[PDB]
Amino acid sequence: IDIHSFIATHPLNLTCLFLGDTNAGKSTLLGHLLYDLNEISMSSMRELQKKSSNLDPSSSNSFKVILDNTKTERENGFSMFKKVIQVENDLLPPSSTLTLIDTPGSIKYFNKETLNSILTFDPEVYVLVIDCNYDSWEKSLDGPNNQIYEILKVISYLNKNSACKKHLIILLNKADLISWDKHRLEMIQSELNYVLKENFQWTDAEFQFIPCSGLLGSNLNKINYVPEWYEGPTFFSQLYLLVEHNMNKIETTLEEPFVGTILQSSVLQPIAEINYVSLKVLINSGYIQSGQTIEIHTQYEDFHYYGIVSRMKNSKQILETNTKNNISVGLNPDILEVLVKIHNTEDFTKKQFHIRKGDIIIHSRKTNTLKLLALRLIKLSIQTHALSDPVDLGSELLLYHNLTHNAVKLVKILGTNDISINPNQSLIVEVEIIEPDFALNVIDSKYITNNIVLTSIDHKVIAVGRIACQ
Ligand SMILES: Nc1nc2c(ncn2[C@@H]2O[C@H](COP(=O)(O)OP(=O)(O)O)[C@@H](O)[C@H]2O)c(=O)[nH]1
Numbered sequence: 272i273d274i275h276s277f278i279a280t281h282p283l284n285l286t287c288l289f290l291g292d293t294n295a296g297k298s299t300l301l302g303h304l305l306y307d308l309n310e311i312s313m314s315s316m317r318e319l320q321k322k323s324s325n326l327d328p329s330s331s332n333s334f335k336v337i338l339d340n341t342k343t344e345r346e347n348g349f350s351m352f353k354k355v356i357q358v359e360n361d362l363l364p365p366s367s368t369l370t371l372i373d374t375p376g377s378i379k380y381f382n383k384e385t386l387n388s389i390l391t392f393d394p395e396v397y398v399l400v401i402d403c404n405y406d407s408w409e410k411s412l413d414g415p416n417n418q419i420y421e422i423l424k425v426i427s428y429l430n431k432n433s434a435c436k437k438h439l440i441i442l443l444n445k446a447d448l449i450s451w452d453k454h455r456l457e458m459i460q461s462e463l464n465y466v467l468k469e470n471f472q473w474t475d476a477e478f479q480f481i482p483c484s485g486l487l488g489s490n491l492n493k494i495n496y497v498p499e500w501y502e503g504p505t506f507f508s509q510l511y512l513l514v515e516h517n518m519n520k521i522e523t524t525l526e527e528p529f530v531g532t533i534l535q536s537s538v539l540q541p542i543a544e545i546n547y548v549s550l551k552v553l554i555n556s557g558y559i560q561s562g563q564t565i566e567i568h569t570q571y572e573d574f575h576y577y578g579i580v581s582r583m584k585n586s587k588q589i590l591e592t593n594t595k596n597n598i599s600v601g602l603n604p605d606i607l608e609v610l611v612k613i614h615n616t617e618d619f620t621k622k623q624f625h626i627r628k629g630d631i632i633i634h635s636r637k638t639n640t641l642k643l644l645a646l647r648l649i650k651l652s653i654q655t656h657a658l659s660d661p662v663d664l665g666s667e668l669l670l671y672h673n674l675t676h677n678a679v680k681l682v683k684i685l686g687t688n689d690i691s692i693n694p695n696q697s698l699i700v701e702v703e704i705i706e707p708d709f710a711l712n713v714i715d716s717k718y719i720t721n722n723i724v725l726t727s728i729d730h731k732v733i734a735v736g737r738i739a740c741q
Pocket residue numbers: 291292293294295296297298299300330331332335348349350376444445446447448483484485486487
């Protein structure tokens with residue numbers, strides 16, 4: 272196989288991450304978009320609807336149940352886990368893929384997954400979904416620490432001074448509940464536009480507003496109606512352009528060292544002298560091909576495993592896909608099932624694998640080698656902005672990095688004798704892991720971002736930054 276040629280025939284991907292409070296209409300809208308993009312067969316729908324007969328009458332609808340596909344989510348009536356859907360069809364630009372990602376707005380689960388989804392997937396586009404119904408909009412803006420502002424406190428400040436520019440779509444959803452109240456939609460747009468510009472430093476070219484109804488599908492593409500006074504674009508038309516302009520992008524895949532994030536892990540049973548581990552892997556950079564030797568580094572201090580890639584398949588997705596056929600090569604940013612073969616050195620019943628979410632996988636460096644750090648004392652290059660109360664030294668914080676979030680202690684504010692972090696500062700800071708026998712896996716490379724977010728124990732954003740390896 273050419274290998275070099277496989278990278279060429281690979282379609283260029285755009286990732287869209289959906290964010291917003293619970294009941295914003297995210298799951299409904301995203302499922303509806305998938306239907307409009309002909310990713311759901313009428314038969315598939317009705318089979319979903321034949322199951323939905325349970326819900327007549329009910330609050331739920333036919334579109335959200337597409338994404339809320341776990342039994343616990345259907346019973347609870349809201350999303351709990353992030354859903355990743357990769358779309359590739361004739362409605363998109365040729366040689367491209369559109370990755371859509373649903374996230375939970377329910378705060379308990381928002382804190383568990385949504386913040387990490389931003390760091391892990393590193394999306395080109397954010398989609399903020401807002402319920403514009405009467406009273407709902409007003410109730411969702413209590414103080415400077417409301418959930419919507421918390422979202423903006425992250426995505427507004429990630430990768431400042433970056434070459435590639437930011438892209439934000441604000442969806443003014445449930446427009447039908449207000450009958451497209453022109454004065455009200457104008458108000459909400461006015462208010463957000465101000466806060467985005469004045470407080471979060473967004474520029475006109477970096478964001479736009481789109482009123483819509485995910486349930487009715489109004490203004491998603493191409494009483495459902497778009498008022499005569501609306502001159503703006505549809506949601507999908509804008510996604511289409513973003514994908515198109517993302518085509519003209521530099522691909523350094525060949526120069527990139529292979530790095531993967533383990534999203535899920537399962538050891539095949541019964542265990543034996545040689546064991547086989549099934550991994551759901553998000554490729555962060557470079558490329559992986561079956562047969563290659565690899566290293567699996569765990570969150571547990573040290574404790575790395577050597578193995579070989581036995582086979583690779585497409586990840587089990589919400590949309591109907593082929594999980595039977597093997598894949599020759601895995602390329603950034605696709606997600607693959609990876610079966611890893613691992614020889615145990617000693618007794619195999621005493622020693623057992625401790626592979627978990629957030630663990631990483633790289634190509635083998637067994638004897639320009641890839642630099643890898645296992646850090647308990649972590650140096651952070653951060654920048655603060657609006658801050659209610661300064662953060663004094665010795666404070667307990669939560670360090671979000673890639674897929675993991677760990678409690679840390681603030682131990683040193685470098686460059687100054689100050690004993691507290693203050694508003695609007697660019698600081699260098701050291702934090703120390705609290706959890707015993709735990710170490711943060713950090714890859715030192717020009718190709719890896721290592722973005723972080725510091726929050727309080729109450730999950731309120733304090734700062735954004737990067738791991739300072741040097
Ligand atoms: N009237 C109206 N209701 C909606 C719309 N989108 C969602 N909903 C309702 O909002 C509730 C929660 O929607 P959901 O898709 O789960 O939003 P999520 O919680 O943010 O993921 C559901 O019971 C829907 O009936 C819309 O465009 N119009």
